[PDB]
């Protein structure tokens, strides 16, 4: 609870945020009241902010900072401070130095000189910076933040993406603990380690469909009589009805696949239009193989060959990368061949 | 952003839009295409319909910013006023504002005040939610700059590339809802899980990626025909036809063209084309002592194209970088080769030709 | 409060302590879920595990040296009040805290006091039962506890599969709770059976199919010619059917690149039993079949003719083959075929097991 | 693996005891206390003055001091009691009143006291020493058994001979002279993960097959004659090919029950079996009778059988590769029940 909500906050400021913002957190008030008028190490980490402004390498325009306190801690100055965001503070006038400090137990004067003599930390920085109490919840409003915000946000690995995102925030938490620097994680690095974390689970290689008709079902044998234009070509090559059971099983089984991995983001619409170039190429290498090795012969044993090597060669394609069944480069041949692309005979083109 | 997809100016601002969302479904534009003005035809029988869907419940308004695209702006009252009208006390005042404004209508545009005056509640949500944009000339380079300020993790490496893709998912809805005439949905879920996929495909490192699109029309194929190269011409030795110099004339362009984005982008290492090129010269090494024992008697031409076609469906399966390349990698690879003079289809290539 | 994994939360405070512990140490696991404070001095279900605890002992299956003994709430049951065994190490401190219990137990239950009658009967040996029981908590944070211990206690612990090797090695411990569990076992955990199971996921979620080998011998080379020169039995196979002097050369190519990395390279990624005697064997059954399919085809030709197809069919035909579910070149394939072919074990020439 | 250096054993051996993180070794010099070469004095506070010069792990490292000896002091059992809070910060103030040798010869760079004079740690570290016995082959065999959740006591080398193969190019090729051995315990196990998965690893994927014309259930089964060997009676095969016919279905026999009792594979396949394996026999059916016309009707079945077997290893079984005997053997099982049919008159006669 001490250490496990102070990264839930920061991912939840890290997801509501753009891809340029650095976000630098503060670690600090572990305890009267924990914070009090004069904050020696409020004053200490507003001194290390404005150096790390003046070091050269931190964004003065869109960094956010940030107090956490888990606490109400009952100050003044501290609401101020939580309150006075962009123009604001009453009307304006950000050159609000000294104004209910009152120089208070000058032992460290070093601070609160450092903050007075600067011009430009002393400016943008308070209407930028809020303060925000701990109201524990937050490992609900961080999983609703996730899945309200972040476009494409995976639900069913929903806790084995949230939990090495909050350990790489942890990391960096603690990495730039350790080394005593604040922290100036950006959101760049934390949009690539959250788009690595999806990708890692968005792999796949193998499409899967429920192959689950058969060829005594209705619809496949109304096909056989209503004869589309695939059926059409097949009945001059003059293969036995036998083979165009599972013809018609698998034309109708790669329309019903190509509407559900479409509706997953699987595949889309150039995919299967690639998938549908690459068969159609491979048509025409067995089209001129099988009229050189066996000519002079008649049109219907050549015909014949043409479908059979075409069955036995376009499985091997990939379709978005990933391996496909049997039933699916088996049923596309017929679904080009629908709309008279290919043709088993050799003299498609004037017969039909 | 790739500006070439078949481009339209409508496609580039709902893709802005939609990736600005927050997971909640867009209505998205009907296109209105100064001829719109208070008095106008084409503009109230898209709003007629537009009331049926929220009472019928396909749509919830409050998880819903409504949205209309005209390609130039016009000049009216009525469609200003529920532009800038998103609170309550606006929605209630512009319903008898706009009323005023069209009171007395034609009767064919009458049919849709009806649908629209039928309800109060219901009327004025709508206009809570309604914004009117427009076209503008920097439209896809607001889209370069949208993409890489709102997406936590935006691929700064291949985002020309994927922005071809989620825009041709976008174009492939609005031509689906103009096909049939029913009102476009597009849902922000299912969006960014296109939009999540496509990321995540330019991201393996096991997969080689190349956006093919050279066709046989295109002026680079036809110039290289035209050209006569050294690949082309033992093409013609075996005496094949138009179409197979045309593919070659694709395959070889695709596969010099591959060669260098690859290498010029870190996929890819420099030493493996060569090792990539030895497999496959050993490969036709093999092919041609198989065809030259397996068509004994038959001429030159018919042993050189059987020979090609031997080549071209077996150096498929070789592997780059143990990576998977594709058919016109593996099909343009023996292509660049004879450019070269390395392998050979015809019989006596190197005597036949210098 | 932590993200989880998808188990229960007895399976990640066992097998939390299960990985702490020795090669040679039992855990007895027990889960009490009766129930607010509802535990106390006359609840019966602590003594239900306590009574089957104990004629173990009796059995001397279980060591009762070094096992550890653990009864497990599945969330903060508050305010024990049998604390004083869990809060004692040590054994002379214990035989006054055996008897500090009788003094609490005072009336035994009302019908099934036989529970605690055979709890009184071997004092010295329960003093060794007192250490080796400590009193567990559901922590609430439950998979950041195990995972943080497996990426500091456990020595070579793979970060890359981290987050799948976890899913698999809590299925095992939960077939061992659950499924030991419908029916009433001695439920005893022994650690050496869990370094096996272990040591199993560690080493099978390492193997990798990027078996490589950077082939920089060419035609341009000495020993090439030395071989050709030489003469070996399987360029004497290549002569009987006399092939040219490129398909020669590139032979000695790939018997040469297959010799110095078939078990030069420690064993390159592979092992030598069961694996390149099973490559052999795949590739002797592919040489039958092609050389009954060349026999078959073409019949009637001079022997070299149908020796030199056989050849090329072979050459075509083994290069799908893996060596333990890993992508091969098609130079091993080559090699492997004439490191065969040397030892007269598969021949081109119909006749070659005649004249040589 | 027993005949190497002796002071080889005592360094994996507390390397072998310990965690993943503090993960620093370190081992330094080879009655003797004080010679006047100074090799033991040497190190003390120069190795680990860089603690205090700015490296890393500087609270988690374990020093190695003692190699073979064993010598008798005051100064070093002083400064080697036990590392408690208020034990570790009361040694360096004791140990400036009974040095024996407060020459400058010795302390040559002289700055440490007064840096290291802080407490504790920042005075005194943790350097405790262990000295090699005549056992220490002995001990650490013990020890890996004892502490390593997994020893590899099939192999009855125990793991060990490769590493110290390992353990001993630190101490010898990694020394860098003058310099610390600084070993890392992190890739210690890691090269650990290596060498233990090289040998433990028996059996992978596939089942073991042994059955190969050694003459019990594979000429037992030839001699019954079952479906798949009468099938192959009429297209006239050889001796040897009813061999591995009778082979093959054995192994596919064992492995489709082994496979689903461990939930590699489900019930919910045999998509494999008959959608799939019946399709490639079906096409091939057809290819042979195209174009392999006016021969003898005993070569056409055997011509089917060839493509039928070069072709099945093709298709996976639950996204999973099989190997040639299951894709072979598989292709008998149905022919068992006279699904397929090498001949094409398979119904008329049998």
Request: with cysteine.
């Amino acid at each position: 609870l001490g250490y496990k909500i102070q990264e839930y906050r920061l991912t939840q400021r890290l997801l509501e945020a753009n891809n340029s913002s650095c976000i630098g957190f503060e670690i600090l008030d572990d305890l009267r009241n924990i914070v009090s008028n004069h904050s020696k190490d409020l004053w200490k980490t507003l001194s290390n902010w404005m150096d790390l402004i003046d070091s050269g390498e931190i964004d003065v325009d869109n960094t956010i900072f940030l107090l956490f306190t888990n606490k109400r801690c009952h100050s003044e100055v501290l609401q101020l401070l939580s309150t006075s965001q962009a123009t604001e503070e009453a009307s304006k006038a950000f050159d609000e130095i000294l104004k209910i400090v009152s120089h208070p137990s000058p032992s460290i004067a070093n601070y609160l000189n450092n903050f007075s003599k600067s011009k430009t930390d002393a400016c943008r920085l308070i209407s930028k910076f809020t303060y925000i109490y701990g109201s524990g919840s937050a490992p609900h409003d961080l999983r609703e933040s996730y899945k309200l915000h972040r476009l494409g946000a995976l639900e069913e690995h929903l806790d084995e993406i949230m939990y090495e995102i909050l350990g790489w925030v942890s990391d960096v938490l603690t990495l730039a603990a350790e080394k005593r620097q604040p922290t100036i994680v950006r959101a760049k690095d934390f949009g690539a380690r959250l788009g690595e974390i999806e990708s890692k689970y968005r792999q796949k290689t193998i499409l899967n469909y429920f192959c689950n008709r058969s060829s005594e079902s209705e619809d496949v044998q109304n096909t056989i009589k209503d004869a589309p234009n695939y059926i059409k070509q097949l009945n001059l090559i003059n293969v036995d009805d036998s083979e165009l059971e599972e013809a018609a099983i698998a034309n109708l089984e790669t329309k019903d696949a190509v509407v559900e991995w479409t509706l997953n983001g699987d595949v889309q619409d150039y995919s299967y239009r690639y998938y549908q170039r690459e068969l159609r190429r491979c048509w025409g290498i067995q089209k001129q193989k099988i009229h050189l090795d066996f000519n002079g012969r008649p049109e219907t044993e050549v015909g014949q060959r043409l479908y059979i090597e075409c069955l036995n060669n376009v499985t091997r394609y990939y379709l978005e990368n990933k391996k496909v069944g049997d039933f699916f480069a088996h049923g596309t041949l017929h679904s080009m061949a629908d709309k008279l692309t290919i043709g088993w005979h050799p003299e498609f083109d004037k017969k039909l």
